[PDB]
Design a protein around this ligand. Structure first.
Ligand SMILES: [Ca+2]
Ligand code: NA
Length: 140
């Protein structure tokens, strides 16, 4: 029963947050960002897994079709935590100039990674709102 965690200041402009956990790439959410339509570095979205589990991989789908198809971070990282206080980076991304629309962020770990929380986190201020479609883990 993983649940969504995300930056509290974002407003749900369209869609609904259950759409991010329904296993359908075609359903998403469009968040309005405050601070003058700016997502600041450190903002995040991901999963609280409820308990510490061994992860074999993740598959997160950022962006969505139509409205807000370009509304994505350009620099962000995948990180995990056991306690929701200390984080460890798995990968850093630069998707400047990525095509508009859904972008599948998928990683596989040869040796499982133990985590209770796992998320994408903005690395650089960007003057955009934000769309997402799906957050999933691969485990056990
Ligand atoms: Ca979905
Ligand atoms: Na799309």
């Amino acid at each position: 029963n993983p649940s969504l965690i995300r930056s509290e200041s974002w407003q749900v402009y369209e869609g609904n947050e259950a759409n991010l956990l329904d296993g359908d790439d075609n359903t998403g959410v469009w968040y309005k960002t405050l601070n003058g339509d700016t997502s600041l570095a450190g903002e995040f979205i991901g999963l609280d897994l409820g308990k510490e589990i061994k992860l074999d991989g993740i598959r997160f789908v950022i962006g969505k079709n139509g409205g807000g198809s370009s509304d994505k971070w350009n620099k962000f990282k995948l990180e995990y935590s056991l306690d929701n206080e200390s984080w460890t980076t798995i990968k850093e991304y630069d998707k400047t100039g990525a095509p508009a629309g859904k972008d599948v962020i998928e990683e596989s770990f040869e040796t499982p990674i133990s985590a209770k929380y796992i998320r994408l986190t903005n690395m650089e201020n960007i003057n955009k709102w934000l769309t997402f479609s799906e957050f999933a883990i691969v485990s056990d």
